[PDB]
Amino acid sequence: IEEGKLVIWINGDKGYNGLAEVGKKFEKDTGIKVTVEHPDKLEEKFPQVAATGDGPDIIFWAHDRFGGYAQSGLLAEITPDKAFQDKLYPFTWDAVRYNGKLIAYPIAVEALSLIYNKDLLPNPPKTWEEIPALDKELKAKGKSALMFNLQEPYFTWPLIAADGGYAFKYENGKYDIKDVGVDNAGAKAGLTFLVDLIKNKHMNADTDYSIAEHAFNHGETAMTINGPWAWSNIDTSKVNYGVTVLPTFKGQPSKPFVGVLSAGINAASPNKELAKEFLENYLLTDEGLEAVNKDKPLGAVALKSYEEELAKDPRIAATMENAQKGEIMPNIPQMSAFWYAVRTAVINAASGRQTVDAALAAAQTNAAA
Amino acid sequence: KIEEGKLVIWINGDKGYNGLAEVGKKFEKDTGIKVTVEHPDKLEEKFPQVAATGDGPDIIFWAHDRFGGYAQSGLLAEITPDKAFQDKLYPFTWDAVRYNGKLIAYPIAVEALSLIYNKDLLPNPPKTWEEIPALDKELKAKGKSALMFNLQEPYFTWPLIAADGGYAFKYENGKYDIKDVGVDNAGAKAGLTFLVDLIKNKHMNADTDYSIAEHAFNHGETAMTINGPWAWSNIDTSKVNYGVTVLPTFKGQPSKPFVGVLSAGINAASPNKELAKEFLENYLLTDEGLEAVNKDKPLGAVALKSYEEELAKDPRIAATMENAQKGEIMPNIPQMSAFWYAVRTAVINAASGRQTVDAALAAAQTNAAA
Ligand SMILES: OC[C@H]1O[C@H](O[C@H]2[C@H](O)[C@@H](O)[C@@H](O)O[C@@H]2CO)[C@H](O)[C@@H](O)[C@@H]1O
Ligand SMILES: OC[C@H]1O[C@H](O[C@H]2[C@H](O)[C@@H](O)[C@@H](O)O[C@@H]2CO)[C@H](O)[C@@H](O)[C@@H]1O
Ligand code: NI
Ligand code: NI
């Protein structure tokens, strides 16, 4: 890492162009260059390169990964005063607190919603169960009912959790890392339903982020599942879209894992104080989050003042409703194992390489340790 | 069923469908006939299914290799250009679209993959595949990667597979021997092993697809990519300073991209065959028609003599044909789709490590020749 400059990592689906603008603002003021990068698999890269005193000064990701990073000593403890902390919602600080210590700045709260084409589908379905029928209706007109990223368990988890699936049993403010709920009747029922959609040709196992985004944004599919970041490209595509509550499964709300986009400071950084200044004084302000948000919507920001200003957006409202129906992700170190294990189970099951039960059985064992 | 009095066109989403739409607008302006260009996923798999029932597009666009099977399945109308029109297009492009004695599509343009490289990151791209690993180790220390390209489709990995002796079907006595497949021979195994090692040694990832490779190169995260003329538009817009050149050699031998002629077939079930003929002959296959499409996404070396002649000066086009002459024109026989799926499975299974190269290619050999 180079002293006297800021290197930033943020995921490619976030507003890195909006952010780089803030970084140029930071440069004009302090003369400090702010390079914004978006590496593939950055959540895997970071720990790798950071373990050897390398990487970016600042790293952006959902809060779930930061616990593991902190346990690995890859993060510097941030030092915001009470005046600053009070600018952000206490529940977002909660998401980035590990072992009593604040290990990153919260930026925004993210949740998946059902996104639907209002012209194709004036009244979107309330349930997963009515999708096969809808799809058959749309296939006759050369469209599909629903397409969404089947490659990342983040997009499929809401369905798996609906009827009883869960990652780690959470009771009395503690997660039981040995009480995993990926192979219970609930989790199996959800994943089986997904696999049945694929077998019945209502979806394809190889659908990923780009295939789904293209499909929805060109009006090839009536629905997709995505987060606030996705809205800008839809704006651009001019599809008349709405954002609403996710379909129920067996009468139960889908339960998305809620993410808090956070900014961590590399423990190897020689630019910690600079990192602090940039994050507290430029990014985490009404105009800073505005620049990012204009590029790619952040969702419900952690900054109270801007969250209030944007709260009137029905898309954000829908995002919070789904958020209330889901659960905020744990940030414990065991999350990476959980995600990896479930990713494998879903891909193996969807592709037909393994039975649902066998896939989730293996994921269950692998998530525990 | 197919609607009378309008044209519906299927074309893959990596091509200039907006450019083609403009040609359709000109067509509608002059004839009053609406032209709708669509880009379904998996269109080459959907066509034979829906055309069989009398459904689908009036015109399908795809590389010539698929059209043989569509023709054998009775899904394509024989096209009827007069001699005067055939003289407007290169004979070898008409050859690409002839099947069992009949013309079964209009050739549009010739495609071949080239090595695309970032001039600012890489002033002197590697001449060989063998020097890429050391090049990557070097760039990874600058926060970059040497090379990223779509590993999901065998079309992109084939140049390397074929370099040392891999092939689809052996030509004998004026026709392809459908039982002589060269996908599990030594050359084919050497090529796929080299790919697999690149993945094993963290120089590439098995999961890299088109979007990831295009994103990476167009943002200068990787110094090189592999792709065809359609991809150039997006690089232009990315402002990346790029060059189009000859693909790397493998074991001192040229990579051999499979050459495809983008072709336009008329659905045998279409009640708009005369409209399709007029659109294709009088609107698309003209200087002004190909130009509209090319300026959206470059076509490569177009089949129209006149337009090809003025574009030939383009260094990227010349580079495309340099790689195309080093390659082989794809067969158009019905067995191609079986070949492609067998190889697709093979490359994915081996790259993911779920199967060994030998096993993957041994299964692919049997499957293609099935
Ligand atoms: O799918 C596994 C993945 O889920 C979450 O990642 C999300 C991320 O939070 C979103 O902001 C967006 O970028 O999509 C990602 C999924 O592709 C977890 O945060 C992540 O740790 C986990 O691996
Ligand atoms: O990968 C198998 C695939 O290869 C060829 O498809 C090419 C096509 O020719 C290009 O124009 C471009 O669209 O990329 C495709 C590969 O993704 C064959 O034409 C096709 O039949 C075959 O399935
Ligand atoms: Ni990127
Ligand atoms: Ni499309």
Q: Give CA–CA dist B81/A55, Å, rounded.
A: 62
Considering only the beta carbons, identify the residue of B38, B41, B219 that sits closest to A211.
B41
- Atom 15 of ligand 1 has which residue's CA nearest to it? A154
| 8 A C-beta contact, residue B300 and residue B260 | no
- Cβ neighbours of B309 (radius 10 Å): 11
Report d(CA B314, CA B293) in Å as an integer.
16
Of B8, B9, B6, B4, the residue nearest B262 (C-alpha) = B9
Whether residues A220 and B40 touch (CB distance < 8 A) is answered with yes
Give the amino acid at A233. N
On chain B, the residues whose CB falls within 8 A of the CB of A39 are 221
Six-digit token pair at A284? 């985490």
What is the per-residue DSSP string for B140-200?
Answer: TTTT-EEE----SSHHHHHHHHHHTT-EEEEEETTEEEEEEEESSSHHHHHHHHHHHHHHH
Task: Determine whether the shortest distance from the Cβ of B155 to ligand 2 is under 6 A.
Answer: yes
- Chain B CB within 8 Å of residue A52 CB: no
Q: How far is A181 from chain B (nearest CA, A)?
A: 28
B212 with A40: Cβ contact below 8 A: yes
Q: Which residue puts its alpha carbon closest to atom 14 of ligand 1? A: A154
Residue B128 DSSP symbol: B
Q: Are A311 and A323 in contact (CB under 8 A)?
A: no
Indicate if ligand 2 lies below 6 Å from the C-beta of B229. Answer: no
| Alpha carbons within 13 A on the beta-carbon side of A79 | 6
Question: Do A153 and A165 contact (CB within 8 A), yes or no?
Answer: no
Tokens of B221: 């995260």
B78 HSE (CA, 13 A, CB side)? 7
Which among A39, A111, A72, A119 is positioned nearest to A332, based on CA atoms? A72
Question: Coil, strand or helix: which one is B104?
Answer: coil
Both tokens assigned to B200: 């094993």
> What interhelical angle do B186-200 and B357-368 show, nearest 10?
140
Q: Distance between CA atoms of A60 and A266, rounded to whole angstroms? A: 11
- Closest ligand 1 atom to residue A154 Cα is 1
Interior CA angle at B191 toward B187 and B194, to 5°?
140
Nearest to B346 by CA among B202, B171, B182: B182
Q: What are phi and psi of A268, to 5 degrees?
A: -95, 0
Instruction: Inform me whether the C-beta atom of residue B41 falls under 8 Å from chain A C-beta atoms.
Output: yes
The answer to whether the CB of A198 falls within 8 A of the CB of A350 is yes
Count of CB atoms within 10 A of residue B242's CB?
A: 24
Q: From which experimental method does this structure derive? A: X-ray
Task: Please state, in angstroms and as integers, the Cα–Cα distance from residue A114 to each residue in A165, A225, A244, following that order.
Answer: 20, 5, 5
Q: Which residues pair with A106 in a beta bridge?
A: A262
- For tokens 């690149």, what's the residue? B198
Tell me the C-alpha distance between B176 and A168, whole Å: 59
Distance of CA A128 to the CA centre of its chain: 21
Which residues fall inside 5 Å of ion ligand 3, going by CB?
Answer: A 12, 38
Which chain B positions have a beta carbon within 8 Å of A210's beta carbon?
209, 211
Bridge partners for A369 per DSSP: none
Contact B221 A12 (CB under 8 A): no
**DSSP state letter for B331:** P
The closest of B31, B50, B21 to B277, measured between CA atoms, is B31
Put simply, the answer to whether A220 touches B41 (Cβ < 8 Å) is yes
For A168-204, b where at least 16 C-beta lie within 10 A, e where not — what string?
beeeeeebebeebbbbeebbbbbbbbbbebbeeebbb
Q: What are phi and psi of B93, to 5 degrees?
A: -80, -35
Q: CA separation (Å) from A63 to A3, A43, A94, A262? A: 26, 11, 10, 6
* Chain centroid, CA B247 distance in Å: 15
User: The tokens of A125 are what?
Assistant: 């379905």
Q: At what angle do helices A335-350 and A185-199 cross, to 10 degrees?
A: 40
Whole-angstrom Cα Rg for chain B: 20
The structure tokens listed for B176 are 């392809």
**CA distance from start to end of chain B:** 33
In chain B, residues 208-267 whose CB comes closer than 8 Å to chain A: 209, 211-212, 215-216, 219, 221
Q: Residue for token digits 């590993």? A: B151
How many other β-carbons are positioned within 10 Å of the β-carbon of residue A62? 22
Three-class SS state of B134: helix
> Would the CB of B326 count as within 6 Å of ligand 2?
no
- Is B153 touching A (CB cutoff 8 A)? no
Q: Cβ contact (<8 Å) for B13 and A214? A: yes
Please tell me the number of the ligand nearest to residue B39's CA.
Answer: 4
- B143 at interface of A, judged by CB pairs closer than 8 A: yes
Q: Comparing C-alpha atoms, which of A71, A105, A70, A110 is closest to residue A88?
A: A105
Which residue, chain included where needed, has tokens 């709920």? Answer: A181
**CA trace torsion B73, B79, B83, B89 (10° rounding):** -80
> Which of A11, A40, A154 gets mutated to test ligand 1 (max ligand atoms within 8 A of its CB)?
A154
Q: Amino acid identity, residue A143?
A: K
DSSP-derived secondary structure letter, B10: E
Do residue A220 and residue B143 have CB atoms under 8 angstroms apart?
no
Beta bridge partners of A327: A257
Three-class SS of B261-321:
EEEEEEECCCCCHHHHHHHHHHHHCCHHHHHHHHHHCCCCEECEHHHHHHHCCCHHHHHHH
Q: Which of A38, A201, A230, A275 is nearest to A116 (CA)?
A: A230
Ligand nearest to the CA of A64: 1
Beta-bridge partners for B115: B226, B245
Q: Which residue of B has its CA nearest to A221?
A: B40
**What is the enclosing helix (H) or strand (E) of B31?**
helix B17-31
- SS3 of chain A: the string is CCCCCEEEECCCCCCHHHHHHHHHHHHHHHCCCEEEECCCCHHHHHHHHHCCCCCCCEEEEEHHHHHHHHHCCCECCCCCCHHHHCCECHHHHHHCEECCEECCEEEEEECCEEEEECCCCCCCCCEHHHHHHHHHHHHCCCCEEECCCCCCHHHHHHHHHHCCCEEEEEECCEEEEEEEECCCHHHHHHHHHHHHHHHCCCCCCCCCHHHHHHHHHCCCEEEEEECHHHHHHHHHHCCCEEEECCCEECCECCCCEEEEEEEEEECCCCCHHHHHHHHHHHHCCHHHHHHHHHHCCCCEECEHHHHHHHCCCHHHHHHHHHHHHCEECCCCCCHHHHHHHHHHHHHHHHCCCCCHHHHHHHHHHHHCC
Integer angstrom CA distances of residue A237 from A220, A313, B13, B211, B282:
12, 19, 15, 18, 32
Q: Is the Cα torsion angle B89, B91, B96, B102 positive or negative in sign?
A: positive
Q: Tokens for B300?
A: 């490569």
- Which residue segments constitute the domains of chain A, with CATH numbers given? 1-110+259-330 (3.40.190.10), 111-258+331-369 (3.40.190.10)
Cα A33 from Cα A39, distance rounded (Å): 19
* Closest-lying ligand 2 atom to the alpha carbon of residue B152: 1
Cα–Cα dist A241/A222, whole Å:
9
Block residue for tokens 């910690």: A272
Distances from the Cα of A253 to the Cαs of A96, A149, A160, A317, B204, in angstroms? Answer: 26, 20, 11, 16, 40
**Helix residue ranges, H only, B32-106:** 43-52, 67-72, 83-86, 91-96
Quote the CA–CA distance of B312 and B307 in Å, as a whole number: 9
Q: A135 near A141, Cβ under 8 Å?
A: no
CA distance linking residue A222 with residue B333, whole number of Å: 37
Partners of residue B9 in chain A, C-beta under 8 Å: none
* A196 and B CB contact within 8 Å: no
Max Cα distance, chain A (Å): 61
User: Considering only CB atoms, which chain B residues are within 8 Å of A220?
Assistant: 40-41
As to burial, measured by CB atoms within 10 angstroms (0-12 exposed, 13-18 middle, 19+ buried), residue A350 is buried
Token couple for B73: 């399945």
